[PDB]
Ligand binder design. Structure first.
Ligand SMILES: *[C@@H]1O[C@H](CO)[C@@H](O)[C@H](O)[C@H]1NC(C)=O
Ligand SMILES: *[C@@H]1O[C@H](CO)[C@@H](O)[C@H](O)[C@H]1NC(C)=O
Ligand SMILES: *[C@@H]1O[C@H](CO)[C@@H](O)[C@H](O)[C@H]1NC(C)=O
Ligand SMILES: *[C@@H]1O[C@H](CO)[C@@H](O)[C@H](O)[C@H]1NC(C)=O
Ligand SMILES: *[C@@H]1O[C@H](CO)[C@@H](O)[C@H](O)[C@H]1NC(C)=O
Lengths: 350, 350, 350, 350, 350
């Protein structure tokens, strides 16, 4: 039971997982599409060499014109003195670099803040189950006292006496939460990961705005082979002019990437917005029980604190651990009640 | 038992599963077929370049004419001044977009209403099994009383006394159902998912009615290569005219998609119609037992409530859980009867 | 034991499984053969273009002549004014449609009548095992009585007394069978599934009789490329005449399909014959025991009843469940007898 | 123990398994080889079209000549007026037909006589184990009586008394074997399966004699393309003459198949011969024990009986069940003896 | 223990396993190499057709020349009137035939002598473990008697008395071995398998000496196409001379096979030599104990006997069962000794 519980612990939340998967998969899918087009078209570009050229010489012209992009500019018949068509060649490598950059912050977060968070969460839940059991065991005596005397004054007096009994309130948890309220490692790592994601998205936006808008259409370009040593070769023409077939793919890729990452600009910000606010209905739900009461009163300071991330993960986990399926119903009863405690006690006893 | 039971819980119903599978498989299958044709034919289009052209120049003409679709229009010999053949090129990408769009609402429904529904169903079934056991334990005493006295007046009096015994009726369940009858999260998500499916089907209809009927046949088209820089090349012709071989595939795809999605317009509406009416024979069957009595008195309210979705899922689950195979036979006995309780008690004890 | 028994339940009969597999597999195998032929020869048809045409022009002629089948009808040199060669192109798609059509009724039967039949069968067998145990427990006392008194008059009197003991006859099963004898859901679904299979087979027969006999041989056909814009091109011929290589495959496919489905016309009819008649030797075998006697007295009604399908599946299952291996031997003894009960009791006790 | 034993039961005599595997594997292997040859050489035949023909025209001639085999005859320069070369084309399809035909009887035997044989075998072995135990438990008393009195007269008298004790001889098995000795279902199915195998082998012999000997060598053949519409084309020759490269493969295939099936004519006959003779050393071995004594007295009847097949599978199974390993050694002792029962009892007790 | 032990029994010896694997793997490896060569070069032979011939005519010449090997002879410029080059074509088929031939005796041995040997070994080991336990139980009393009286005369007398105690010597084993010493089934099958291996090796030697030495080099050969109908074609040459590229592979294959099988001529003979001599140090080691003594006194008979094969397998198995882990050490002690029994008893008790 305990062993399986530790393994099932969610240490990356349910929503950030989809963001990570999208941000790491989209560039890989686009790069795979680029390679698929490269191997489907056979030749990345096609050139209109004169009829005299044999097949091997035409292939030489094709290869030399396609390989001379990263080194020298090539100008089309609508452009200024120079235009750079290098992004057509380095597209898949840039996509791989983007994928690695987007994956980096995930590795940073995991390696830097998985162990401390795991230890804190497991300790807290282990203490909290026992705390809940100890808190509930007193409800029987509370019910007996309430049955004996109906007036609410004695009920309140006995509630205060039980709170002062000192059989609970777990000073271990008190001091641990007090220490956590100062720590900043978890919030630092979370904010840093989100900021890295935002910075890399902005880097992609800049890359696609500077080096893709200029040559977005760039149908054809006038290549040259005489720049080398065969400058005295009269057989070859001077300015063989040719085009690149995969252009459409390139276009789509660029646009596609932009769109996807725009969808990820709000969501990520929302993830960063979660910390600035304490997690309210559930707060009122858990205020009643002493076991959760101790951690409920630790929300007077600035919302940015190491205990805030622990609270987020604790809620995301207790939604399934099992220790939440009851108090919610009890507080639903309390909301419905104009007796609620008696009904809850009967249900718990059953 | 409890662990395996929660795993087997059906959280997506049996009928909607087929619709979800179809709406995603169909576009993916059509896209795979399109790619298979593209790699089987080798060239998406074929062009009738003059004899003088070498193989490389003919390949250049083919590539330039096929790549100049998304950018410029191409006119056939039966058309108006202009006609755009771009849908021939962006077909697989549009299929990707449609597949993602149809998969989106499934993800929305899952991530937004799987956990609340799962918890509610688990709690309800856990309470209901014990409720049924407690209800049946009293049938023995009822049988003893009936054996002692045969008149029906004492039967009615003892039934009323048992109903007033307060050993059951589970006020927990009463308050939970009362609270649920106000919730709207589950119905909101269900209606939103169905409406998203309908909206995306209408979007596909509009897309295939606007951008496919015009170029549905469009056998051939007259391409041009002189639009670029090689406008002084007398060697090349002016208006090389050529055709696209995969046309038939395209045609079929369009038609096929339409048909399939039409089949999904009624079914989805039926899914939306399930909520407008409370689930009648089964209601009368379960009215008898006190355990199901509490949840069978909620039919008065408006059909659109969070308890309605829970009722649908509860019926779909109880059809196989085990807690239904008995009461159905007991109410069949009641219908057949002009002793039934004694026979049912004997069967349950066995 | 109980859990494994439920899974092992045969809910589709042994014979109908082979019919389903054949009907859903034959078209898929033929379609795979068609695609294999399409990709083995490289091209579906071959055309005899003049010598002047380059390779690219010949490929254009081939593609345009093969793609102009669905859109226009071509004419061979043995035919009337015009003939339709479109079935050569839409063959694999028609095979896909046929496979889906034949698979549809299986899905209908499953989704519509798997749960009710499963519940009824499991309940009936669960009752019947303990019913047989209770019935056999009395054979010891019966044997003691027979040993004490040898005359058959007392034997018959004690048999009647035991039948009237009211310790068995399970009124639950009496009423359940009385109810099932009116239901018609299972028979309706079974008849509908078989009728759908027959209707789809007849549809295939009509399709192959209308759209394949006309162009069954159709060796060659005269294609034309001037129909488009290039009507002023004197270089091209007028009526390029060419042939389709895969014809033989097509032929075989058609014939093959016909044959297979003919084999399925009797068998399916035989499946519909099983309902019109009740399942006789086994009936007399099971008449003796009280446990099976109750369901053995329902043969008077009409053969078409919901209890008939349940009987068929019950026999098909009890052939392996274990509850049949004994009574058959006991009735074999009874047939051989000119003591049998004592021998059967000894065997059962062992 | 019991469960695993049922699964391990053999319902296909070891020897027949190899025949079943061979008769369905050889044609499949040959067909795979034929397809491998078809795809290794690229084209099934090669034709010697004149030099003027372009590559596409030569491919058209090849396809039309290879496709015109099933439709029209083709004559070589050594033949009569006509010769039919269609077996070259329909070879793999005929191999598929042969494989299906050979597999059909296996399916018939399974579906028609697996369940009855399985039930009979399992019942018989289940009874026989306890029967052997009961027979053995009396050997101790027999040994004590023999020790008390050494004369053989008292030994024979006590043996007769034990045989008459009525504590065994299992009248259940007496009646069951009496009923089985008249049944003919198992022998009918076995003989029918063997006869089907023989008939299909004879069909293959006839097919390979009528349609493969005539064109066994048939090196070349004179094809023609003018039969169609292009009878006014002076460019094409009249009687293009060409050959088929895979001939050798074809030859081998034919021969190979013949050889294999000849090997299967004796073996199958042997399988049919086993029924005509009752299973002799083992019969004398098992005659001694009372448990096997009852089933050893049925040899008088005609060899063809359902009990004969049950005996065959019973021996094939008891060779490994475990019940055979003892009595064989005991009868070996009896053969060696000029005390044996005492030694056997000691071994069994150990 | 008993179940796992029977599975672990080795019924094929360790040394013969390597021979069986090699004799079936080598030809398969060579055949795979031959097919790999056939598909690596594209064509099996190359022919020097004149320049006038087009590509298709050259392919026709290649195919016709390579296909006329099995039918007609072809002579090079160093040979007699005729030389046969058919072994170049039937090489992989001959390799398959050889692989099947070498695998046949393995199947024969398995199907004919796996069950009898398995049963004999199982019974022997099962009785032998108990025999050893019974034999060792008396060593304690032997030690007590030796301690009481030190003289060896009483030790010998008590050893004889124990041998005559009749509490062991297992007459079952005596009679089983006596019966086995006459049986010849196992020796017959073993010798037949070895002789089949030798005969097939000799057949391969003859095949490679007759049909490979003649045409071992046979660089080129003169092919003719005019033998057919096209004898009036002046366009074609008369005696096209051409070569076969894979020759080297062929050569190697032949040589390789020879070498491997020579390595298998001694080893197999050694396997046949094992039976002519009874298995000596181990015999003297096991002669001491009464359990092994009974089977150690059968060495007098002829070496060829069914008990000899059982002895070989029994030693090969007892080398790993566990029952040998002590007696070997005990006889090592006896060899070392100028007390040994006491030390052995202490070790066995521990
Ligand atoms: C064609 O080839 C000749 C020599 O091979 C060369 O002089 C001429 O420049 C070539 N044509 C063009 C357009 O360069
Ligand atoms: C054929 O080639 C010549 C020169 O190479 C060119 O002038 C002519 O335009 C070409 N034919 C066509 C139809 O363009
Ligand atoms: C052959 O080519 C010439 C010109 O290229 C053309 O006029 C003629 O029609 C062609 N042959 C045929 C049969 O069309
Ligand atoms: C060669 O071609 C010419 C015309 O292209 C044709 O008349 C002649 O028949 C051809 N040769 C043969 C052997 O058919
Ligand atoms: C070359 O071709 C001519 C006719 O096309 C033919 O007569 C001659 O034999 C050929 N040369 C050779 C070496 O076959």
């Amino acid at each position: 039971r305990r062993g399986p519980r530790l393994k099932g612990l969610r240490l990356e939340l349910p929503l950030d997982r989809i963001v990570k998967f999208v941000a790491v998969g989209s560039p890989l899918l686009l790069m795979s599409l680029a390679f698929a087009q490269e191997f489907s078209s056979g030749s990345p570009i096609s050139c209109f060499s004169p009829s005299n050229f044999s097949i091997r010489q035409a292939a030489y012209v094709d290869s030399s014109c396609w390989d001379s992009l990263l080194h020298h500019k090539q100008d089309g018949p609508g452009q200024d003195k120079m235009k750079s068509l290098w992004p057509h060649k380095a597209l898949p490598y840039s996509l791989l670099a983007l994928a690695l950059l987007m994956y980096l912050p995930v590795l940073l977060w995991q390696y830097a803040a998985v162990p401390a968070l795991s230890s804190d969460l497991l300790f807290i839940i282990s203490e909290l189950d026992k705390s809940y059991n100890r808190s509930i065991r007193l409800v029987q005596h509370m019910l007996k006292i309430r049955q004996k005397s109906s007036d609410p004054y004695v009920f309140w007096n006995e509630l205060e006496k039980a709170r002062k009994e000192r059989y609970f309130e777990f000073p271990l948890l008190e001091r641990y939460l007090a220490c956590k309220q100062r720590s900043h490692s978890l919030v630092a790592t979370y904010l840093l990961r989100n900021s890295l994601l935002l910075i890399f998205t902005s880097a992609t936006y800049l890359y696609l705005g500077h080096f893709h808008l200029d040559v977005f259409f760039q149908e054809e370009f006038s290549c040259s082979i005489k720049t080398g040593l065969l400058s005295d070769e009269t057989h070859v023409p001077n300015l063989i002019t040719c085009r690149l077939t995969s252009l459409s793919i390139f276009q789509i890729v660029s646009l596609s990437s932009v769109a996807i990452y725009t969808i990820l600009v709000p969501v990520i910000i929302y993830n960063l917005t979660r910390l600035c606010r304490w997690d309210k209905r559930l707060l009122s739900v858990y205020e009643m029980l002493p076991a959760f009461d101790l951690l409920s009163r630790k929300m007077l300071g600035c919302p940015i604190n190491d205990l805030n991330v622990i609270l987020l993960f604790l809620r995301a986990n207790i939604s399934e651990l099992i220790s939440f399926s009851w108090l919610s119903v009890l507080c639903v009863l309390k909301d419905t009640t104009t007796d609620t405690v008696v009904d809850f006690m009967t249900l718990l006893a059953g």
